[PDB]
Write a protein that binds this DNA or RNA. Structure first.
Ligand code: MN
Ligand code: MN
Ligand code: MN
Ligand code: MN
Lengths: 103, 78, 97, 93, 16, 97, 84, 105, 94
DNA sequence: ATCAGAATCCCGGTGCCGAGGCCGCTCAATTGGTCGTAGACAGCTCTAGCACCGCTTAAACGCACGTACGCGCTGTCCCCCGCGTTTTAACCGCCAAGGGGATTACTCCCTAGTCTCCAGGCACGTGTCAGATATATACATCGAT
DNA sequence: ATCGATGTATATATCTGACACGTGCCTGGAGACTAGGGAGTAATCCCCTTGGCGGTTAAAACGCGGGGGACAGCGCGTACGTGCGTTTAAGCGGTGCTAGAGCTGTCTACGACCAATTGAGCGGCCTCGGCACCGGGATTCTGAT
């Protein structure tokens, strides 16, 4: 498999097919699926790293949508990449305005 | 039928939004805003359903409509 | 005893910002979806996941709208959200002309 | 009917960053939707890149310059690091 | 694993 | 002779809203573009139309921002735009967190 | 070559004032001018970063009008009158 | 009839639109009715703008349409403004609009 | 030199149909040429995804028509659909 | 209620170049024919969405009280506007030179295409531990004093 | 700051359905291999970008003086929050019925592909009239007396 030859867990073969049948260009050169599969594997690793930490902080071992929302909205760059994206059953960050707190 | 979006339901949404005090005319303004949102999304979703020659609006038609409206949604396919 | 006005209001904010469940009743929302869809095409059916997809997007849209609405009220030295705050948020967003 | 997803692949990634953690079906679809969206966003930028330069091929260079346009600075820097590493390793083997 | 993960997760500063 | 404070401003508003010429001087804006671009990559050249396209887009962005900014100032019962009006506008339209 | 330094001050106070006049602004605070320079610098950085990325991918030393137009379209600020 | 635009009663080139669709990586195959339909829609939208811009050019006592006339046309029509809500027209200016609270007494 | 295509002659034909005694400047024509290419990409892009959503490999007049209804506003879409349907049937008869 | 300095509107004349037109060269669209597969169609299947029901209860509802928040009015302060004067450099025109954008021509390697082989990946089927639920307590915390 | 209590947070006792794993069937990925074209690369001309100079002057910059908007203070009215008791409906468990979504086979209508043909459409050259520009004058109105 091309995934093992690239050292990746994501399917290099499946990515190459989706680039062909996606009507992105007349021809898809080699390495482009392994490059994209590695970028997709890295980004999933980045979210699962921060979401798994959110699960351990929330005293749970299984990552729920709440743990994915906490991981993305607390990271400056994942929030900017997913700015126009809605994560279902994720809720919002705890944020109370200072002028609304009592004295 | 639009009044099904009750007042305490709108208050809960505002409470999640960090709102402490809510005016009285907010609820009728919120129902009108919610209606305009559903009108734009369901119009595009039904358009996807009519193009597929189907009589059942699938979740993908909703995900596709939200995507082109700029309201991309994760977790419901796509 | 009796709590002062605004005490349990902040308590509700901390309660609903901590949870992720839906806040609109599903059946009144489902009837609202089928009513609006009836005006675009008749004799339509909806998947269970299709109605829940609309509710997840509608609530997340309104919650984000109240966050912008709340900021407009604070900008005007107020703590109560008013229709003029929603109209300003949607105008700056580009939704309202 | 045979439906495909990235479920088995995000597990192998999850076990490398957190071996003693799990993931629910709700969060699994969210991860599955996240991969497809980023896949389309990157491949779409790479498509326009080839069209803008009157070229017919999407190689690893179009994928790289598409990552630098779509991902934020610090995320894009490490993504190119992961991308360039896998390509040179795929060529050696 | 071999993932070159960024060591810092900065919080986005928001209005107010 | 002296005009009262406000009559010349409203006169300038009418003057520049009827016209379409660029309001930033060409050479200062061109040096700013070369300076910012030099920090991204050295040894860069620009087509004369590439800089004009940047000034046409930058000025159109700032004017549209000054409109939403002015609405935030008027929302707070004010006539003067202040930095907090700009930041609130940039936050609502999604440019800020 | 000459070293470019402190060119954000090229956007003079009256130039920011004219842009606000076209925006329908009557009175302007004194701290607006430094705020506008910061907003414009952030705007120019995002557009030029993408433009020169298209220039780097095309293996060129010159930033073309199409590089700027392709970048503005990415940001959601499509521009007419220079190509595309 | 020779050109495909004459068979469709159109002014826009159906043959060019057909080539752009095929060489644009939109689908593996392109139907024969797609370039006809698309070139007709592009002709209608072009006509709709040139109609309103020509009036603006006449209201400004000018013969030739300049970018300013294209801006006054798009921004004054609600439908065209929604279609080009995220678009900037170079040398187009803005619509004259002054808030009421800014006006004196 | 280089042969660069444009919609200049076709926009100029439509202009004379609508305003026979009216011209267009070089800048305004470039803006029109930018308008056509943008709408072209939007419609063709939506029609491209419409085929992919339904596992089709052909963009026909039906996909482009559906893309018009999604993109154009109310009255613009109703009239643009009338123009396309009129043209595609006139093209079929000839 | 009257009168003068300002800016804007405007009016004829003048001069410059951009648009509109003509002409001929070239490339993309037209024409006509074959091949092949996507798509339209029809028959079969079974999944999923719809419909009707009543019990327990959480939720929506309505009323009542009294707070503190919204908002109109006032007054104090100083910031920002308008303007004359001094200072600065943008703008224009004109020239120099070279680097790099764009066209061009030739060899190849990299990928689409086809065929045969096989395991990675998915549906399914099932047991178990994470977690939903909850009662009683623990404790963080608000309002009265 | 102190004190009663009020809702919230922690604990751990027990139940259940979703998760993570296991089995085997299979379809998409991979290995082997041919053919052609996209593009990598070296060559070349000229477009236009960068650089520099001075004469001209609109624009920028700095300082002056005061008018009016920012905003803090404040009083009055009432709209909304908290909460106890009344009314409504949604959520759940369970079952019945079929529309329609989906999937398998079959045939042709349609569009990719290719080669000879030719004028639509473009660049290059040309010419004048739309309109930019200069300078005179009529009109509007805002501010001073
Ligand atoms: Mn620098
Ligand atoms: Mn050279
Ligand atoms: Mn105390
Ligand atoms: Mn070539």
């Amino acid at each position: 498999t091309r995934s093992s030859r690239a050292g990746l867990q994501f399917p290099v073969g499946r990515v190459h097919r989706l680039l062909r049948k996606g009507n992105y260009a007349e021809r898809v050169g080699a390495g482009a699926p392994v490059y994209l599969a590695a970028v997709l594997e890295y980004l999933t690793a980045e979210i699962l790293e921060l979401a798994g930490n959110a699960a351990r902080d929330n005293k749970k071992t299984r990552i729920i949508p709440r743990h994915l929302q906490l991981a993305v909205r607390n990271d400056e760059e994942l929030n900017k990449l997913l700015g126009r994206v809605t994560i279902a059953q994720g809720g919002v960050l705890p944020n109370i305005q200072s002028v609304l707190l009592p004295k | 039928n639009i009044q099904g979006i009750t007042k305490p339901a709108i208050r809960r949404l505002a409470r999640r939004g960090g709102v402490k005090r809510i005016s009285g005319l907010i609820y009728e303004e919120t129902r009108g805003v919610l209606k305009v949102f559903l009108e734009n999304v369901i119009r595009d979703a039904v358009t996807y359903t009519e193009h597929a020659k189907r009589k059942t609006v699938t979740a993908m038609d909703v995900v596709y409509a939200l995507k082109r409206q700029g309201r991309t949604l994760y977790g419901f396919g796509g | 005893h009796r709590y002062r006005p605004g005490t349990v209001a902040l308590r509700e904010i901390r309660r609903y910002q901590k949870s992720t469940e839906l806040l609109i009743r599903k059946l009144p929302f489902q009837r609202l979806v089928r009513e609006i869809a009836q005006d675009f095409k008749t004799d339509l059916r909806f998947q269970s996941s299709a109605v829940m997809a609309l509710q997840e997007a509608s609530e997340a849209y309104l919650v984000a709208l109240f966050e912008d609405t709340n900021l407009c009220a604070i900008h005007a030295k107020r703590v109560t959200i008013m229709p003029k705050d929603i109209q300003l948020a949607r105008r700056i967003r580009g939704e309202r002309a | 009917t045979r439906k495909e997803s990235y479920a088995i692949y995000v597990y192998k990634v999850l076990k490398q960053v957190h071996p003693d953690t799990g993931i629910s079906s709700k969060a699994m679809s969210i991860m599955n939707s996240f991969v497809n969206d980023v896949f389309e966003r990157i491949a779409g930028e790479a498509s326009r890149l080839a069209h803008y330069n009157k070229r017919s091929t999407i190689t690893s260079r179009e994928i790289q310059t598409a990552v630098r346009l779509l991902l934020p600075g610090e995320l894009a820097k490490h993504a190119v690091s992961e991308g360039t590493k896998a390509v040179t390793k795929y060529t050696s083997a | 694993g071999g993932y070159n993960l960024r060591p810092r997760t900065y919080q986005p500063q928001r209005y107010g």
